[PDB]
Amino acid sequence: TYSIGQKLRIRVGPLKGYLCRVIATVKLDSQHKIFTVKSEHLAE
Amino acid sequence: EGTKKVSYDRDTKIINAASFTVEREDHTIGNIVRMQLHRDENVLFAGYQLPHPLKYKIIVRIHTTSQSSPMQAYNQAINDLDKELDYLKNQFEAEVAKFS
Amino acid sequence: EKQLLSSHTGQLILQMGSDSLLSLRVMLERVFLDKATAQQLAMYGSLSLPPPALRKSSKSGPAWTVFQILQLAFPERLSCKGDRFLVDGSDLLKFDFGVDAMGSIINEIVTSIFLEKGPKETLGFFDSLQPLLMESLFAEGFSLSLEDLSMSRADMDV
Amino acid sequence: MIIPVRCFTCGKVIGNKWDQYLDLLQLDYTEGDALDALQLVRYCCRRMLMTHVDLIEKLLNY
Amino acid sequence: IILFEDIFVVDQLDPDGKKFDKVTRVQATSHNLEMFMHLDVNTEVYPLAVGDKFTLALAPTLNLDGTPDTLADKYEYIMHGKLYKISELYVSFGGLLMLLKGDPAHISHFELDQRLFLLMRKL
Amino acid sequence: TYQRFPTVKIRELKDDYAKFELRETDVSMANALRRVMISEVPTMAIHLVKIEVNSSVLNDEFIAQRLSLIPLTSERAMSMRFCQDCEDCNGDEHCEFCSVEFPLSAKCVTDQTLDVTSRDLYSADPTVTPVDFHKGIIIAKLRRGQELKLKALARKGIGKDHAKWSPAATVTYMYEPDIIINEEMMNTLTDEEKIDLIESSPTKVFGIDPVTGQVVVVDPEAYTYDEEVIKKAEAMGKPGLIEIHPKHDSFVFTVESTGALKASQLVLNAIDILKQKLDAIRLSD
Ligand SMILES: [Zn+2]
Ligand SMILES: [Zn+2]
């Protein structure tokens, strides 16, 4: 699948197109929310 | 969500009265409908309420005479309103054209 | 539902609020309401309002009053008998009007309601009366301008 | 700070006008005989110009 | 269908005012009946002068004999209330008090805790 | 069976202003038009900036905000698709359907400072541009050696989620006034009193006659419903010399736009989205 520290994109959702970084469970580049989503909802 | 946008619940004690809940709507819809339900002879009581000011849902209650069921009136109103708008659109369009 | 009776003053601790009293006063100042306005307030009530107060007139048709709104806000059955107001099954008979006696009157009303039926009925009555009154005022509006603080130079010289 | 883009009450777009305020003011126009010729007419909007402190000229220098 | 019928003349005004932002408790007397009646009426919509003649009627139902509320259209003024004290008649039209001093013979048909209506017309 | 028949009659139109006069409808219709215009007619505006070299004096999140509020021409707004729908994309870059990208870049390489205005935002769909009005909306000022380079992704929205996306600088109506002067009580007043009745009107509705020296309503439209002329009369004694009350059909609406959507097509566009609303609440059977 993926690896720690990758930069992925939130494909579908209220938060779409946001870029985020995968702490372990992604974290957004400039906001404090730690969301967790499955692989289908994440893109390079 | 997919819960039906409009839902119907008959009121048990009083005949010919029912309550409709319209999700994701607010005072723009409620006030327009209320005032046309009050343009009808058969309807006796009509109003809208926001269940909590912060939630977008309206509940509309209609009490009517024997001659018409609540559902009939509600549907009638909407239909009537729509037809009004069409009259305005046509009218406005005509005017803008004239101005040019 | 158990600490309503105060062990300090003896009366209900659920006293009157500023906005509540202001709305009740500006609502009692106008005894009769319109049709759409009356229907829109009852919505926040508990039950419907079959009988209208004013059936037919010269220019107005069905016109209700604030008394029936308070009745539909009142519990189902109650009998206060406080030498100034009579009620029989959510049917208020008379309601006196003064400068500040309205607060004491409604306090006696709520104390009688609490001692008759229970605390849950009073809680429901308050929860049905507060948003109704908040909505009543909201349409009307209340504010103070600079004219309210008028010096009245004649009275000033006096 | 630099003139805000849109008035905060009615959302007009005023952020286009700063310069022509200043310029006109550097002729001999009473503010308000100017804010008129820039055609702002509600007072939610004639606030946002008459009461802005520039602060970018400075922040650039230091 | 009308239970009571009488013509009243304006005897006196209790508050002694016109636009005091309150309902007027007008005092009236019957013609050739010796009956005093007090009533609260909205004067802003129904103007009433000092010493005027008007008709007054009592009706349990407006339509024919059956369910209350064919309809009586001659009376331009209407009120809805409920009798609560048979003994002197004491009826309040949803807050508007009404007092009667008629003899018991003429008001013997009134029952306690009944739904009634007040029909009024200015001749 | 029951259905009103409203009737419009435009007075001035331009691409930003429009003053139409609806007659024969309830206020509850006009309010609805107002409300929906202010906050449902959709527009397109910037909604995810991505910055690579800010060197300026203003921090990044003050450049973002400022960018978004810039008014962007959006005739195509009603035909797009709220991103949260479009499943033709991952949400990045142009998607003919849902987003349009706007690169911007600038670096001062002289002495006198460079205003990175808005005429320096370049887009890739040549539809969604920034609205042009004479120099545009300063987004930053740069001094020698300082640089900004950003790529932005516009999107479509409703002004009830932020007001970046709302197409109106105030829509409003006025119940047209109806003024009746008692014209015979007004014969009672002496000249002076009249000219202190005239001039107790905040605005100017009333006005003396040259000749007969009578108060003659001379502009009914300008009566904010204050109560001043009335209450001065009461005080002067004569009550109800002038009674002024709303007519309660005729309104006079006045729409003004941010430039994103022409005024005309703001109104028409409102009526249209109202219909689409109503026609979703039909309960069928
Ligand atoms: Zn403004
Ligand atoms: Zn897309």
Residue in chain C lying closest to E90 (CA):
C93
Give CA–CA dist B86/D20, Å, rounded: 44
CATH architecture assigned to B6-98: 2-Layer Sandwich (3.30)
Alpha carbon separation from C81 to C105, C113, E79, F202, F227 (Å, rounded) = 11, 11, 25, 53, 44
What does the DSSP 8-state code read for residue F208? B
Give CA–CA dist F72/F165, Å, rounded: 10
H-helix segments, B3-69: 27-37
Q: How was this structure determined?
A: cryo-EM
Query: Which of A9, A14, A18 is the closest to F84 by Cβ?
Result: A14
Beta bridge partners of B22: B6, B58
Whether C97 contacts C28, CB under 8 Å: yes
Helix, strand, coil distribution of chain C in percent, nearest 5: 45, 5, 50
Give CA–CA dist C102/C96, Å, rounded: 8
Q: Among all chains, which residue has been given the structure tokens 């003649």?
A: E53
Candidates E95, E92, B48, B64; CA nearest to C71 is: E95
Give CA–CA dist B58/C43, Å, rounded: 12
Indicate the Cα dihedral angle F266, F272, F273, F274, nearest 10°: 110
Query: Which of C31, C55, C91 is the closest to E78 by Cβ?
Result: C55
Alpha carbon separation from F245 to F30, F219, F224 (Å, rounded) = 19, 15, 11
Q: Return the axis-axis angle of helices B27-37 and C35-42, rounded to nearest 10°.
A: 130
Candidates C38, F28, F250, C34; CA nearest to B27 is: F28
Range of the domain at D36: 1-62
Whether D1 contacts F66, CB under 8 Å: no
The structure was resolved to a resolution in Å of: 4.3
Q: Which residues of C touch B47 (CB under 8 A)?
A: 39-40, 42-43
Closest-lying ligand to the alpha carbon of D10?
Answer: 1
Give CA–CA dist C77/C66, Å, rounded: 19
Give CA–CA dist C101/C80, Å, rounded: 17
Indicate the Cα dihedral angle E99, E104, E108, E112, nearest 10°: 40
**What are the b/e assignments for F142-171, b being 16+ CB within 10 Å?**
bbeebbbebebbbbbbebeeebbbbbbbbb
F48 at interface of A, judged by CB pairs closer than 8 A: yes
Candidates F41, F276, F20, F253; CA nearest to F168 is: F41
**What are the b/e assignments for D20-53, b being 16+ CB within 10 Å?**
ebeebeeeeeeeeebbeebebeeeebbebbeeee
Give CA–CA dist F135/F118, Å, rounded: 8
As for how many domains chain D has, the answer is 1
Interface with chain A: mutation pick from F54, F92, F101, highest number of A CBs within 10 Å = F92
Give CA–CA dist C73/D14, Å, rounded: 51
Tokens of A38: 């499955």
For chain B, what is the total number of helices (H) and then of strands (E)? Answer: 2, 4
Alpha carbon separation from E83 to C24, E42, F97 (Å, rounded) = 27, 20, 71
CA of F102 from ligand 2 middle (Å) equals 16
Alpha carbon separation from F50 to F45, F103, F148 (Å, rounded) = 15, 10, 11
Give CA–CA dist C102/C104, Å, rounded: 6
What does the DSSP 8-state code read for residue F70? S
Query: Which of F4, F25, F283 is the closest to B6 by Cβ?
Result: F283
Distance from CA of C54 to the nearest CA of B (A): 15
Q: Could A17 and F48 be called an inter-chain contact, meaning their C-beta atoms sit closer than 8 Å? A: yes
Tokens of F241: 């010399």
SS3 label, residue E36: strand
Give CA–CA dist D17/C87, Å, rounded: 67
Residues of F with CB under 8 A from a CB of D: 57-58, 66, 69-71, 113, 133, 135-138, 140-141, 143, 163, 166, 168-170, 258-259
Alpha carbon separation from F186 to F57, F204, F219, F232 (Å, rounded) = 67, 18, 19, 14
Per DSSP bridges, beta strands F100-107 and F172-173 are unpaired
Give CA–CA dist C4/C111, Å, rounded: 10
Tokens of C52: 């209208």
Give CA–CA dist C139/E36, Å, rounded: 42
Whether D45 contacts D6, CB under 8 Å: no
F140 at interface of B, judged by CB pairs closer than 8 A: no
Distance from CA of F55 to the nearest CA of A (A): 18
